[PDB]
Design a protein around this ligand. Structure first.
Ligand code: FES
Ligand SMILES: [Mg+2]
Ligand SMILES: [Mg+2]
Ligand SMILES: [Mg+2]
Ligand SMILES: [Mg+2]
Ligand SMILES: [Mg+2]
Ligand SMILES: [Mg+2]
Ligand SMILES: [Mg+2]
Ligand SMILES: [Mg+2]
Lengths: 96, 128, 99, 48, 86, 137, 122, 107
RNA sequence: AAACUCAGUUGACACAAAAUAGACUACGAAAGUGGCUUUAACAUAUCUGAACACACAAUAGCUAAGACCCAAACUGGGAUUAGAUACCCCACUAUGCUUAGCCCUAAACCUCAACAGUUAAUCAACAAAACUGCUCGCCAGAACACUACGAGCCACAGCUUAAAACUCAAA
């Protein structure tokens, strides 16, 4: 009938759905190095998702892993292990 | 309860499963599986023993068999957790639902209803 | 053989352009107020950029410049609003002058 | 395939026979489960 | 108690400006929520009051974030009136 | 090396020194800024008591104790005692959000002692015990 | 099912460590487990002091025992670990590798909630 | 990113119990809140301690007294400069919001 | 003021409670549930369906046996006040905790019933937009009255069901 009329399709220009840094990666309570990347260096508090930039599922995984490691003796509770203070910062917190 | 040596429902039909190590067989047996797998084995046994089409699950007979296995699981659970009010409620609700299913089956297909009652040991008592 | 609205829309440069994000367009300063340059770039709206500190005098009415578009229109919905609030102007970055 | 892979793995399972050997091998070796993540989501395995 | 000392909540003073060190430590505690937590734990906040306060704070944060978004969105339109007079 | 707000880690080989001593060997000036009283005890690296000073012990009484001025007085007295007992640099550890929290450090410095680290050890239970009921005035 | 026993043992020499590991694996096998693998995570300073069997511990040797055991054996193994005196702290968990990584396409956003209030002028 | 408001309030079509119970409607107002409102006590303390140990004879406390006086003058100057500096402002922001008001109704 | 001569550091140490995550909004029928691990486990392939039964039902409370850090009705002391049987401070008990039974009430409220559907021609006001179909429950001026009587119940100063008379033109 008419070829210039718009066609029914999806959005070919759709930008990729942003993926959390941990998407597709296995959060384990033994990976204390990864877990310490989401705990405050000074108080040991677990950062919120507004700081970690994690999806809900990965935030819950991180929290459960941190608690399990802390109670199983893999991770300090009140502070970040000093061995990991110099790891790639991935948290949107600026104390100074 | 099926013997602990029984295989899981998914592996009972894999070819050559009789030519694997005793360790592999024990890994795939009900001994190294939770109670849900044992309940599934019970359910398949009952379906084979009663229903005319063991491969059909949407039928009311299959529904009654599955619900009876669930009721047995709840009764076993409450034998040990006597103060589990949530599972007591689930058990009573499941008994009521099985009564309703049996009522419908009795009204529709009586011979199948008798077969179900005999197989599952259910006595269909009329409501007061 | 008269072009229809469908044909015109299909073959228009704006339609040929995809999303207006990070697209280099040629704007034309049509109004200047202090260091604010109102630039029209063929969209429905204009972009109000700031006279670059370098070559500032070179930016005068009618000057044709290069913009990197970020949004044809600056609109967004806010808590409780039933319809988008629009500031009636595009978003673009002034990359310099076209010669 | 699951059972096939399981049969392969069962050969390596610790048993009452190869128990001292496996215990000593474990004492000798060291498994490291740590690995950091960068802002770009690239694993950073530690250097040992 | 069972942890190592002088690692948690410890800041090092630079060039002797203990005031700057204490400001940094206070910022750390406030951002981590320890100051507010201590103030609230001084007296027992009954669960219903705690829930009401949490809900009120959540609503306040939503409203403030939305208002800040609106302000930042409209801030560009604080330019000089281009069509003055007409 | 560049200045880092994080304290040096025990066991780790560090070049930082104060009066020829490592961080783990510096004396510790425990401050306790209660709601209405500031206490200050300076102990050695091996928890050997050296000095003590409190707003109450400084002659302040009743509400006067819970003020910044009383905290400064206590800090100055503790600093003087520690100085005469052989203390130059101190790691300050304060547990309490009372009015004397910072004034105690100010006095502890004005009395001579230099501070190298400020530690907050305010006991923050992860719930645990139940605090007293709220006040209706 | 598949369990993983994270086992922090008292810091001791190699002969005693091997004896303790052999005893623990023996207890698992007696209870009916299939010890699939043993992994040494390396001796390290515990994150916090642990007081097990009236003895304070600041360092310990970390191990993982990946096994398959019947569900009824976990409680007995936990009791045996508690009785054992060379174990600073033992914990049996479900093996993480059994759990499957559900695919996440991306972080789908939540648009601003709409029509929470009537459109009447107030 | 603002916290989600989907399924938070008690509404029809919301099976779950409310997450939030806002006393006022969560609708942006066309205005923002108004700007909500000792100094140099250490020099005073120094001067007063010197007075206490000297019997309040300013002759030998001159330095501390001059410091205290200069600090008070600086405090007044700081008050003046802060006032003039204070004088985005809530008034201007309210003008902007009036220009772009929130429309919680239809038209 | 009264109170204690107990207070600071360090080390050992719960049958109590469960920072941060949580700016998540999930699970459960509701009450409820936010430390860790494991086991068991989250009824119904059609919906509605209890004053007509079965099973639950926070806190408080009763009975008996234990625990007791802290909190804490009552009580005692200090202070305030015209008084202060309160508010404020201190001490401490029942009680909060575990076990086995009871008790069966909440502003048990999201005051918005279950199921299915619609967004079209709006809609007293406010609140959380307006409705359609179907089903059960409930309501018919206020107060008397979460009352009396009767009945049932492990309840004995109780709970559930629940009136009438007199009164008023209002509520
Ligand atoms: S972004 Fe993919 S799981 Fe979070
Ligand atoms: Mg029904
Ligand atoms: Mg009912
Ligand atoms: Mg009850
Ligand atoms: Mg008691
Ligand atoms: Mg409620
Ligand atoms: Mg009542
Ligand atoms: Mg009655
Ligand atoms: Mg009666």
């Amino acid at each position: 009938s008419n070829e210039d009329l718009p066609i029914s399709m999806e959005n070919p220009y759709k930008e990729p759905l942003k993926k959390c840094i941990l998407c597709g990666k296995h959060v384990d309570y033994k990976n204390v190095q990864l877990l310490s990347q989401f705990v405050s260096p000074f108080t040991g508090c677990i950062y919120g998702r507004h700081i970690t930039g994690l999806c809900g599922k990965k935030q819950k995984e991180i929290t459960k892993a941190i608690k399990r490691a802390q109670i199983m003796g893999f991770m300090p509770v009140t502070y970040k292990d000093p061995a990991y203070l110099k790891d790639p910062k991935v948290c949107n917190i600026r104390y100074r | 309860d099926p013997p602990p040596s029984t295989l899981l429902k998914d592996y009972q039909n894999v070819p050559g499963i009789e030519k694997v190590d005793d360790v592999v067989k024990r890994l795939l047996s009900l001994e190294m599986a939770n109670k849900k797998e044992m309940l599934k084995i019970k359910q398949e046994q009952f379906m084979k023993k009663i229903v005319a089409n063991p491969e059909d699950t949407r039928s009311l007979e299959a529904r009654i068999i599955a619900l009876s296995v669930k009721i047995r699981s709840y009764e076993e659970h409450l034998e040990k957790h006597r103060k589990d009010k949530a599972h007591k409620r689930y058990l009573l609700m499941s008994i009521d639902q099985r009564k309703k299913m049996l009522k419908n089956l009795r009204n529709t297909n009586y011979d199948v209803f008798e077969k179900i009652c005999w197989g599952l040991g259910i006595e269909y008592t009329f409501p007061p | 053989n008269v072009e229809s609205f469908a044909s015109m829309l299909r073959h228009s440069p704006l339609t040929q352009m995809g999303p207006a994000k990070d697209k280099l367009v040629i704007g034309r300063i049509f109004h200047i107020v202090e260091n604010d340059l109102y630039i029209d770039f063929g969209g429905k709206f204009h972009c109000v950029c700031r006279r670059p500190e370098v070559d500032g005098e070179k930016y005068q009415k009618g000057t044709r410049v290069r913009l990197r578009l970020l949004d044809l229109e600056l609109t967004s919905r806010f808590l409780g609003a039933t319809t988008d609030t629009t500031v009636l102007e595009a978003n673009a970055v002034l990359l310099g002058i076209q010669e | 395939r699951e059972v096939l892979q399981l049969q392969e793995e069962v050969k390596n399972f610790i048993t009452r026979e190869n128990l001292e050997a496996r215990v000593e091998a474990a004492l000798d070796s060291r498994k490291n489960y740590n690995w950091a993540i960068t802002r770009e989501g690239l694993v950073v395995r530690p250097q040992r | 108690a069972k942890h190592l000392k002088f690692i948690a909540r410890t800041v090092m003073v630079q060039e002797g400006n203990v005031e700057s060190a204490y400001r940094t430590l206070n910022r750390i505690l406030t951002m981590d929520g320890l100051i507010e937590d201590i103030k609230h734990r001084r007296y027992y906040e009954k669960p219903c009051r705690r829930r009401q306060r949490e809900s009120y704070e959540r609503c306040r944060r939503i409203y403030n974030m939305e208002m800040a978004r609106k302000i930042n969105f409209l801030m560009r339109k604080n330019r000089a009136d281009p069509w003055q007079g007409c | 090396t560049k200045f880092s707000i994080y304290p040096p880690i025990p066991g780790e080989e560090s070049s930082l020194r104060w009066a020829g001593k490592k961080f783990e060997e510096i004396p510790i000036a425990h401050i306790k800024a209660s709601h209405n009283n500031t206490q200050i005890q300076v102990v050695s690296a091996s928890n050997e008591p050296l000095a003590f000073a409190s707003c109450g012990t400084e002659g302040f009484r009743n509400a006067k104790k819970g003020t910044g001025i009383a905290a400064q007085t206590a800090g100055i007295a503790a600093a003087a005692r520690a100085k005469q007992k052989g203390v130059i640099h101190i790691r300050v550890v304060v547990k309490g959000l009372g009015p004397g929290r910072l004034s105690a450090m100010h006095g502890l410095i004005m009395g001579g002692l230099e501070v190298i680290s400020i530690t907050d050890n305010t006991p923050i239970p992860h719930n645990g015990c139940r605090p007293r009921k709220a006040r209706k005035l | 099912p598949r369990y993983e026993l994270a086992l922090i043992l008292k810091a001791m020499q190699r002969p005693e460590t091997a004896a303790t590991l052999k005893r623990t694996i023996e207890a698992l096998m007696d209870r009916g487990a299939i010890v699939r693998d043993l992994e040494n995570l390396g001796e390290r300073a515990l994150p916090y002091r642990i007081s097990a069997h009236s003895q304070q511990h600041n360092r310990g040797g970390y191990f993982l025992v990946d096994f398959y055991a019947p569900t009824a054996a976990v409680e007995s193994m936990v009791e045996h670990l508690s009785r054992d005196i060379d174990v600073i702290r033992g914990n049996i968990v479900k093996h993480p590798l059994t759990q499957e990584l559900k695919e996440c396409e991306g972080i789908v956003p939540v648009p601003l909630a709409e029509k929470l209030y009537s459109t009447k002028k107030r | 990113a603002t916290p989600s408001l989907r399924g938070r309030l008690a509404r029809f079509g919301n099976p779950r119990k409310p997450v939030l119970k806002p006393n006022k409607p969560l609708i942006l107002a066309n205005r923002v809140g108004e700007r909500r409102r000792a100094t140099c006590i250490t020099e005073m303390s120094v001067m007063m301690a010197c007075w206490k140990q000297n019997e309040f004879r300013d002759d030998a406390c001159r330095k501390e007294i001059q410091g205290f006086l200069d600090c008070a003058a600086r405090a007044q100057e700081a008050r003046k400069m802060r006032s003039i500096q204070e004088t985005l402002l809530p008034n201007k922001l309210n003008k902007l919001l009036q220009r772009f008001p929130n429309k919680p109704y239809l038209s």
